[PDB]
Subunit: 163 residues, 6 copies
């Protein structure tokens, strides 16, 4: 549901004094190859929340080249015993790929909160419809790592309940 792009690219000007839907852009003539790579995932999680989750975000706020292009990827690492609590992504679907460890991944539908839940091991994909309450719990040994691909440059994230 992100607005369609009206040109090739439009790098977010993160220090603009203006506020618009999304971000104003830098001069596209000034873009270089370096603007289209993002290397943030090379930094390991620097900490975890009280529930054992670290999220490393890659939205247009972190990766200016994502502006207008409709995509986000977030890396989630769960300590042993860690969980996400109940969360939503208000403005995007989330396609989860497990890459390390083992997790319980589930979402609740809008039909009396019917729960669709599966155990994921590395390689597994799990799709979360937009805005629906979901969770991840680490059920394996060591850390669990998964990547969420979302169809918005800024899906948003909200903690909705605790466990």
């Amino acid at each position: 549901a992100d607005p369609g792009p009206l040109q090739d690219f439009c790098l977010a000007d993160l220090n603009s004094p203006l506020f618009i839907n999304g971000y104003p852009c830098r001069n596209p003539a000034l873009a270089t190859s370096d603007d289209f790579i993002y290397s943030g995932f090379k930094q390991a999680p620097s900490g975890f929340d009280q529930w054992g989750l670290n999220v490393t975000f890659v939205t247009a706020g972190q990766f200016p080249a994502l502006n207008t292009l409709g995509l986000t990827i977030n890396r989630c690492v769960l300590l042993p015993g860690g969980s996400t609590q109940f969360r939503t992504n208000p403005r995007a679907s989330s396609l989860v790929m497990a890459t390390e460890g083992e997790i319980l991944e589930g979402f609740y539908s809008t039909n009396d909160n019917q729960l669709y839940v599966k155990r994921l091991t590395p390689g597994d994909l799990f799709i979360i419809p937009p805005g629906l309450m979901h969770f991840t719990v680490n059920v394996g040994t060591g850390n669990a790592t998964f990547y969420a691909s979302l169809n918005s440059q800024n899906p948003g994230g909200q903690i909705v309940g605790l466990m």
Copy 2:
């Protein structure tokens, strides 16, 4: 640019005799937890094209639960010396994450085909705007693996 969903989910009925924009759906009341997991990536590449590329596709055609939900992920594995050739994804952006090996990833803009190209190592991301000509070359020692996340259930792919 995928049409927005008008309900929670709508699993593609791949055996329907009808043809519509996207796919007709199975009865949502019959959907189970098993319908929202996809395990295709656990199968290693079974072969490679003449250029050393294997693509393992996860569109709504392979993962029915993606129907109406606007996302695709593809796994690409390149043998040493492998290349993707020049390709487009006509109907989606592509966000590439390198996970193994090292690649050259680039795309051409519509302004005299200016080339934006970078070396990617595991962890790096590279964004290809929708429809733009792009390529990947394996410049590392072993196999290169990267995943393309696309904002369509069926972005399409074309060698140009």
Copy 3:
């Protein structure tokens, strides 16, 4: 974010054996004036949930002419002491109009769940961004009534927390 209409109207065929995004339609040549009125709100709430809320829904599931046209209105009645609990509308904004009694209406943003809350009396409007956790509490005398206008034929509704 509802798909745009590709013709004047497309009345939901609610007894179709097919399932598609949205609803298949009846033959538009068979539509009559009666198909574009909906009188469900003339029935008073027939009951309330354990927390004192009655919702009378008008989505495309109840009002076939809404199919493809991107709108829903729901009537909410709260008994004295009643509340909605914490809820989301996953796929639409919600514009609330209070018409009877007095309510506390609020939503939480995705920025550390900052709460935006106001007391509403009849005539007041309050806008809930899409997918964001929100609530209504009856703080007046007697029943509270408000109408939610949503920009989807089927916004969805999910109870996300209790109070």
Copy 4:
């Protein structure tokens, strides 16, 4: 058909010197609870046009918090004998709810202007597809009041 929002909210800066599709926004960090309520409907109609209609508008121009969020509600009050004349909402559907009095509400399709018209009494809803010519006539004894919910922050209005 309103562009999707790219953040939680984006209050219209109505005093901006810039002009863009929609409105530039105020700093979201400065938004308060007061920004998400609108109390304009507490003012009764201050006057009526020659045809006995008063419209009290709530678009993003009046209610800045509606900016990017895709909704509008307008209150229409018709004096006895009043009428709206033939009008369109070019960029949105209109879902009409009658709340006081009795009205004739109708719209014309694009198929030889077939007329779909119904009598509405309080509680009734009537849906007008986007852009289609429509009208309301007061057929009751007192004032008629109805609210139009539209799926745009700025649907537009035109007498045709």
Copy 5:
């Protein structure tokens, strides 16, 4: 505002008994090159309305390959003294190109119907925003021909006034 296509093409099955938003499609495997050409404009206008206008329509109803692809072209020919009356295209912009003769082309805005009117000679373009009341009158000698490009497979057309 047409829904985005979810595949390469989707030729309208005009003989389907089903009704959905837009059209159900033929088997894309059966599509041939001939399905993507439309030659209706080789037919001259066969008649004119009360007022001297002939419209030759190319929507998805006439050109099945337009289904899901978001475009329509209409050819309009005006006899001497002919006019369109006041009309709207409810669901699309219209980009008019004059190719023969001379016309007065105008639309009214929603701001108290301010009139934007220009007269066009062959080669000229004039843009009509979506849904806005507009008209064209033949002000030259002989026939006037112009083509309307619209960003919908089925923009719709309505006479709204009589001029």
Copy 6:
């Protein structure tokens, strides 16, 4: 896929120092009738590329009134023996109308590049789905002229192969 317009019109301010998705706009109160006509097609092609193609562009970059309104028209003239090479329009469908001369027009699908090719004479239409590789070659005598209608204010254009 162009973002929907949020007002009647929004003429591109091409002299703005700002960069956003699309274009910032001039004050709509200053717009006049002349802002909605574009006469660029009155200029004949001033030159041709290596290969005998001239494109006269009418995007929002040339015709500011197209901004937010979702349409573009391009005129293409091919010298004898001329061709476009393999090209894409990344962000729009293209509806081609041949008006002078004779052309071979084709596009390749994403299904192993199956070729859909037709030859066109004046009046014929041919639809190119968005982003798909396509070409036109002049196969008649003299100049060939066709107009491309695209459902974007800035579809973009890319040479993808050399034929």
